[PDB]
C-alpha cells in the first residue's frame, strides 16, 4: 500500500498512490504497463518501498497511417521514330491517393525513425503514357570501362559530350566525321556530338577494338590507359 511513489515516466513526473507487489505491477495499476522495449529503474520485479523513485523509459514501435499521393502506373508505347536511348513522358497521368502505413519508432513519445510498411489505394491514379524509342539499329550495349571513357572525355572535351567547338572533331571522344560514319555512328545521330554519351561509347568501342586505347594518344596516357 505504498502511496509515496514518484514515477518519472519518459520525463513526466507524477505522484502515485496505488498498491501492487512489484514495480511492473505498479505501472500496470497506473495503466501504463511496461510494453515492448520499455525499461525501468529499479528492476521490474523490485519491491515497492516508500518515497521510492521509479524511472521508466518508453521505447515503442507504432502504426501510423498517412494519406499520400499515389503515382500513376506508366503504360509504355513504342516509337520506332526515336532512338531506344530516349524515353519520353507523353502523358503524365493523374496522381491518385493512398493510405500508407508506416512503422514508427518512438522513444518517450518522440519519433526516432520510420519505415513505410503497407499501402491501400483509396483513389486510383489514372495511367501515364511513357513513349519509348524503338528505331531499329539503335540498341545500345552496356558501357564497359567508363572512368576511362569519362577521363578521355575529362581530357578531350572538358566532359561535355555534346561538344561542337569547331575544328574537325566532334563529341566527348573527339570523333572525326569519317570514322564516326565508317564505324556505324549514323544509326544513332548525324554526328558524334548529337548522340548520347552511351551511343558515342558504342561507336568508339569499335575503334578501340581495332586499335585499342591509342586513338586518343595524349588522352589515353593522361587517363592511364593501356
CSV table of C-alpha atoms in Angstrom, one decimal:
chain,number,residue,atom,x,y,z
A,1,UNK,CA,0.0,0.0,0.0
A,2,UNK,CA,3.0,2.4,-0.7
A,3,UNK,CA,1.4,5.8,-1.6
A,4,UNK,CA,4.7,7.7,-1.7
A,5,UNK,CA,5.9,6.6,-5.1
A,6,UNK,CA,7.3,9.1,-7.7
A,7,UNK,CA,7.3,7.9,-11.2
A,8,UNK,CA,9.5,9.6,-13.8
A,9,UNK,CA,7.7,8.3,-16.9
A,10,UNK,CA,9.6,9.2,-20.0
A,11,UNK,CA,10.2,12.6,-18.4
A,12,UNK,CA,6.8,13.3,-16.9
A,13,UNK,CA,6.8,13.3,-13.1
A,14,UNK,CA,3.8,12.2,-11.4
A,15,UNK,CA,2.9,11.0,-8.0
A,16,UNK,CA,1.2,7.7,-7.3
A,17,UNK,CA,-1.0,6.1,-4.6
A,18,UNK,CA,-1.6,2.6,-5.9
A,19,UNK,CA,-0.8,-0.8,-4.2
A,20,UNK,CA,1.0,-3.8,-6.1
A,21,UNK,CA,3.6,-6.5,-5.5
A,22,UNK,CA,6.4,-5.0,-7.7
A,23,UNK,CA,7.2,-2.1,-10.0
A,24,UNK,CA,5.8,-3.6,-13.1
A,25,UNK,CA,2.7,-4.3,-11.2
A,26,UNK,CA,2.7,-0.7,-10.1
A,27,UNK,CA,2.9,0.5,-13.6
A,28,UNK,CA,0.1,-1.9,-14.7
A,29,UNK,CA,-2.2,-0.5,-11.9
A,30,UNK,CA,-1.5,3.1,-13.1
A,31,UNK,CA,-2.5,1.7,-16.5
A,32,UNK,CA,0.9,2.4,-18.0
A,33,UNK,CA,2.3,-1.2,-18.0
A,34,UNK,CA,5.7,-2.0,-19.3
A,35,UNK,CA,5.4,-2.8,-23.0
A,36,UNK,CA,7.7,-3.6,-25.9
A,37,UNK,CA,11.2,-2.3,-25.2
A,38,UNK,CA,10.3,-0.2,-22.2
A,39,UNK,CA,12.7,-0.4,-19.4
A,40,UNK,CA,12.7,0.9,-15.8
A,41,UNK,CA,14.9,1.5,-12.7
A,42,UNK,CA,14.8,-0.1,-10.2
A,43,UNK,CA,14.1,-3.6,-11.8
A,44,UNK,CA,10.6,-4.6,-12.9
A,45,UNK,CA,10.3,-7.3,-10.2
A,46,UNK,CA,11.7,-5.0,-7.4
A,47,UNK,CA,9.6,-4.5,-4.3
A,48,UNK,CA,7.8,-1.2,-3.7
A,49,UNK,CA,9.2,0.8,-0.8
A,50,UNK,CA,8.1,4.2,0.5
A,51,UNK,CA,9.2,7.6,-1.2
A,52,UNK,CA,10.7,5.5,-4.0
A,53,UNK,CA,11.9,6.9,-7.4
A,54,UNK,CA,10.9,4.9,-10.5
A,55,UNK,CA,12.4,5.8,-13.8
A,56,UNK,CA,10.9,4.3,-16.9
A,57,UNK,CA,11.9,4.8,-20.5
A,58,UNK,CA,9.4,4.2,-23.2
A,59,UNK,CA,10.8,2.6,-26.3
A,60,UNK,CA,8.0,1.5,-28.8
A,61,UNK,CA,7.0,0.9,-32.4
A,62,UNK,CA,3.7,2.4,-33.6
A,63,UNK,CA,1.5,2.1,-36.7
A,64,UNK,CA,0.8,5.4,-38.3
A,65,UNK,CA,-1.3,5.9,-41.4
A,66,UNK,CA,-0.9,8.8,-43.9
A,67,UNK,CA,-2.8,10.0,-46.9
A,68,UNK,CA,-0.2,10.4,-49.6
A,69,UNK,CA,-0.1,10.8,-53.4
A,70,UNK,CA,-0.3,7.6,-55.5
A,71,UNK,CA,1.9,7.9,-58.6
A,72,UNK,CA,0.4,6.7,-61.9
A,73,UNK,CA,1.4,3.5,-63.5
A,74,UNK,CA,3.5,4.0,-66.6
A,75,UNK,CA,2.0,2.5,-69.7
A,76,UNK,CA,4.7,2.1,-72.4
A,77,UNK,CA,4.1,2.8,-76.1
A,78,UNK,CA,6.6,2.3,-78.9
A,79,UNK,CA,8.0,5.0,-81.1
A,80,UNK,CA,10.2,3.5,-83.9
A,81,UNK,CA,10.9,7.0,-85.0
A,82,UNK,CA,13.1,7.7,-81.9
A,83,UNK,CA,16.2,6.0,-80.5
A,84,UNK,CA,16.0,3.3,-77.9
A,85,UNK,CA,18.2,5.5,-75.7
A,86,UNK,CA,15.4,8.1,-75.4
A,87,UNK,CA,12.2,7.7,-73.3
A,88,UNK,CA,9.6,10.4,-73.0
A,89,UNK,CA,6.7,11.2,-70.7
A,90,UNK,CA,4.0,11.9,-73.1
A,91,UNK,CA,1.0,11.9,-70.8
A,92,UNK,CA,1.9,12.2,-67.1
A,93,UNK,CA,-1.3,10.8,-65.8
A,94,UNK,CA,-3.3,11.9,-62.8
A,95,UNK,CA,-1.9,11.0,-59.3
A,96,UNK,CA,-4.3,9.3,-57.0
A,97,UNK,CA,-4.2,8.9,-53.3
A,98,UNK,CA,-3.2,6.1,-51.0
A,99,UNK,CA,-3.2,5.2,-47.3
A,100,UNK,CA,0.4,4.4,-46.5
A,101,UNK,CA,1.1,2.7,-43.1
A,102,UNK,CA,4.4,3.4,-41.6
A,103,UNK,CA,6.1,1.6,-38.7
A,104,UNK,CA,7.2,4.4,-36.5
A,105,UNK,CA,9.9,4.0,-33.8
A,106,UNK,CA,9.4,6.2,-30.7
A,107,UNK,CA,11.3,6.8,-27.6
A,108,UNK,CA,9.5,8.6,-24.7
A,109,UNK,CA,6.8,9.6,-27.3
A,110,UNK,CA,9.1,11.3,-29.8
A,111,UNK,CA,9.6,9.7,-33.2
A,112,UNK,CA,13.2,8.5,-34.0
A,113,UNK,CA,12.7,6.5,-37.2
A,114,UNK,CA,10.0,5.2,-39.6
A,115,UNK,CA,9.6,2.9,-42.4
A,116,UNK,CA,6.6,2.5,-44.9
A,117,UNK,CA,5.2,-1.0,-44.5
A,118,UNK,CA,2.0,-1.2,-46.4
A,119,UNK,CA,-0.4,0.7,-48.6
A,120,UNK,CA,-4.0,0.5,-49.5
A,121,UNK,CA,-5.0,2.6,-52.6
A,122,UNK,CA,-8.0,4.8,-51.8
A,123,UNK,CA,-8.5,6.9,-55.1
A,124,UNK,CA,-6.8,5.1,-58.0
A,125,UNK,CA,-4.4,7.0,-60.3
A,126,UNK,CA,-5.1,7.4,-64.0
A,127,UNK,CA,-2.3,5.8,-66.1
A,128,UNK,CA,0.6,7.8,-67.6
A,129,UNK,CA,1.8,7.3,-71.0
A,130,UNK,CA,5.5,6.8,-71.5
A,131,UNK,CA,6.7,6.8,-75.1
A,132,UNK,CA,9.8,4.7,-75.6
A,133,UNK,CA,12.2,4.7,-78.6
A,134,UNK,CA,12.3,1.6,-80.8
A,135,UNK,CA,14.2,2.7,-84.0
A,136,UNK,CA,15.8,-0.4,-85.4
A,137,UNK,CA,19.5,-0.5,-85.1
A,138,UNK,CA,19.6,1.9,-82.2
A,139,UNK,CA,20.3,-0.7,-79.5
A,140,UNK,CA,23.0,0.4,-77.1
A,141,UNK,CA,25.2,-2.1,-75.4
A,142,UNK,CA,26.2,-1.6,-71.8
A,143,UNK,CA,29.2,0.7,-71.2
A,144,UNK,CA,32.3,-1.2,-70.1
A,145,UNK,CA,35.2,0.8,-68.7
A,146,UNK,CA,33.8,4.3,-68.2
A,147,UNK,CA,36.1,6.0,-65.8
A,148,UNK,CA,38.4,5.6,-68.8
A,149,UNK,CA,35.8,6.7,-71.2
A,150,UNK,CA,34.9,9.6,-68.8
A,151,UNK,CA,38.6,10.5,-68.5
A,152,UNK,CA,39.1,10.7,-72.2
A,153,UNK,CA,36.0,12.9,-72.0
A,154,UNK,CA,37.5,14.8,-69.0
A,155,UNK,CA,40.7,15.1,-71.1
A,156,UNK,CA,39.4,15.8,-74.6
A,157,UNK,CA,36.2,17.8,-74.1
A,158,UNK,CA,36.2,19.0,-70.5
A,159,UNK,CA,33.5,16.4,-70.0
A,160,UNK,CA,30.9,17.8,-72.5
A,161,UNK,CA,29.7,15.1,-74.7
A,162,UNK,CA,27.8,17.4,-76.9
A,163,UNK,CA,30.8,19.4,-77.9
A,164,UNK,CA,31.0,21.0,-81.2
A,165,UNK,CA,33.7,23.5,-80.8
A,166,UNK,CA,34.6,24.0,-84.4
A,167,UNK,CA,37.7,22.3,-85.7
A,168,UNK,CA,37.4,18.8,-87.1
A,169,UNK,CA,36.4,16.6,-84.3
A,170,UNK,CA,33.1,16.1,-82.5
A,171,UNK,CA,31.9,14.9,-79.2
A,172,UNK,CA,33.4,13.7,-76.0
A,173,UNK,CA,35.9,11.4,-77.5
A,174,UNK,CA,36.6,13.8,-80.4
A,175,UNK,CA,35.4,11.7,-83.3
A,176,UNK,CA,36.1,12.8,-86.8
A,177,UNK,CA,33.2,12.6,-89.3
A,178,UNK,CA,34.7,9.9,-91.4
A,179,UNK,CA,35.4,7.5,-88.5
A,180,UNK,CA,32.1,8.2,-86.8
A,181,UNK,CA,30.5,7.1,-90.1
A,182,UNK,CA,32.7,4.2,-91.0
A,183,UNK,CA,32.1,2.5,-87.8
A,184,UNK,CA,28.4,2.8,-87.5
A,185,UNK,CA,27.5,6.2,-85.9
A,186,UNK,CA,24.9,7.1,-88.4
A,187,UNK,CA,22.3,4.7,-86.9
A,188,UNK,CA,22.4,7.0,-83.8
A,189,UNK,CA,22.9,10.6,-84.9
A,190,UNK,CA,24.5,12.5,-87.9
A,191,UNK,CA,27.3,13.5,-85.7
A,192,UNK,CA,29.1,12.1,-82.7
A,193,UNK,CA,28.0,15.1,-80.7
A,194,UNK,CA,24.3,14.8,-81.4
A,195,UNK,CA,24.3,11.3,-79.8
A,196,UNK,CA,24.3,10.4,-76.1
A,197,UNK,CA,27.4,9.5,-74.2
A,198,UNK,CA,26.4,5.9,-74.3
A,199,UNK,CA,25.7,6.0,-78.1
A,200,UNK,CA,29.2,7.5,-78.5
A,201,UNK,CA,31.0,4.9,-76.5
A,202,UNK,CA,29.3,2.1,-78.5
A,203,UNK,CA,30.6,3.6,-81.8
A,204,UNK,CA,34.0,4.3,-80.2
A,205,UNK,CA,34.5,0.8,-78.7
A,206,UNK,CA,34.6,-0.3,-82.4
A,207,UNK,CA,37.7,1.8,-82.9
A,208,UNK,CA,39.1,0.8,-79.6
A,209,UNK,CA,38.8,-2.9,-80.5
A,210,UNK,CA,40.7,-2.4,-83.8
A,211,UNK,CA,43.4,-0.2,-82.3
A,212,UNK,CA,43.0,-0.2,-78.6
A,213,UNK,CA,43.1,2.9,-76.5
A,214,UNK,CA,45.8,4.5,-78.7
A,215,UNK,CA,43.4,6.5,-80.9
A,216,UNK,CA,43.5,9.1,-78.2
A,217,UNK,CA,47.3,9.4,-77.8
A,218,UNK,CA,47.7,12.2,-75.2
A,219,UNK,CA,44.3,11.4,-73.6
A,220,UNK,CA,44.7,7.7,-73.1
A,221,UNK,CA,48.1,8.5,-71.5
A,222,UNK,CA,46.7,11.3,-69.2
A,223,UNK,CA,43.9,8.8,-68.3
A,224,UNK,CA,46.2,5.9,-67.5
A,225,UNK,CA,45.0,3.6,-70.4
A,226,UNK,CA,47.0,0.6,-71.8
